[PDB]
């Protein structure tokens with residue numbers, strides 16, 4: 001395992017991290033959470049991602065119980081929560097000072113920690129001034145309840161606004177953003193966010209590096225019975241991939257699988273290493289519903305030399321989705 005700075009910050013994250021979306025509290029019960037988390041930790045993963053919205057708090061409860069039982073040195077790992085979806089009522093969601101503060105205190109108790117290393121705004125809230133959210137985060141910094149704060153799937157206008165508010169009012173700037181990023185989804189990391197890396201030093205913990213599992217190639221011939229897209233409650237996700245746009249992407253996945261075979265690598269490994277080939281990626285957050293998948297994904301790290309500039313160019317040619325850079329006149 002190698003480690004990268006989270007943007008310009010001094011926090012060093014393992015290049016692969018481990019998250020809990022979908023799996024914790026359903027596919028992954030309390031005992032399996034402990035097993036997966038210890039396996040990740042023994043492999044050198046030092047960042048574990050969660051959110052208040054994940055199974056309505058139960059993912060964080062399970063992760064906190066695992067953390068307590070496993071007894072890791074607190075200085076040896078990084079844990080997050082993310083605030084946005086904390087219930088159905090108007091004060092239980094969004095990024096108001098009230099819900100940012102309530103959700104932080106609630107996450108501390110669920111995760112059974114005294115502080116969060118990382119605390120993300122899970123989505124942007126167009127109904128709360130970004131200034132208010134930044135002020136709420138700054139109070140949590142000064143109280144010692146969080147160390148770094150950031151955002152997820154914000155746009156570059158919103159992020160630039162947050163940095164400007166922090167500077168104007170003497171508040172703590174954000175550190176980091178958590179965007180989806182994979183061969184099939186590149187718009188924010190390689191497009192919208194491009195100027196923010198040099199301007200602000202924005203770090204990235206990227207989400208869904210296998211496109212919910214599409215980039216394993218496991219769906220090329222149909223839908224496995226034991227697969228995310230077949231889970232009850234995720235019919236919306238099966239639907240998105242059944243659209244014509246989702247079907248064209250799946251046809252490109254077949255070409256990517258042929259490229260991987262040509263290289264002597266699984267498509268899973270190619271897709272994870274592709275993310276790491278971007279120097280603006282601080283960490284790739286892995287997802288796994290079972291130990292064998294975590295082990296498989298960790299094995300990708302042995303094949304870095306197979307992912308060359310020539311391979312990156314061929315992937316660009318297959319998918320055709322490399323975002324345009326800054327425009328000149």
Ligand SMILES: NC(=O)c1ccc[n+]([C@@H]2O[C@H](COP(=O)([O-])OP(=O)(O)OC[C@H]3O[C@@H](n4cnc5c(N)ncnc54)[C@H](OP(=O)(O)O)[C@@H]3O)[C@@H](O)[C@H]2O)c1
Pocket residue numbers: 018019020021022023027049050122152153178179180206207208209210211212213214216218226227228229268285286287288289290292293294296297
């Ligand atoms: N902030 C956000 O908006 C956001 C959004 C998404 C994710 N995230 C974060 O990113 C983390 C990872 O996202 P993700 O779970 O979507 O990652 P992913 O790698 O795109 O999908 C992971 C899923 O694919 C299947 N899988 C993984 N490895 C496999 C393997 N080697 N072979 C076969 N199947 C495999 C498993 O699902 P099945 O076994 O059920 O098929 C696993 O649950 C999340 O836990 C979360 O921390 C954040």
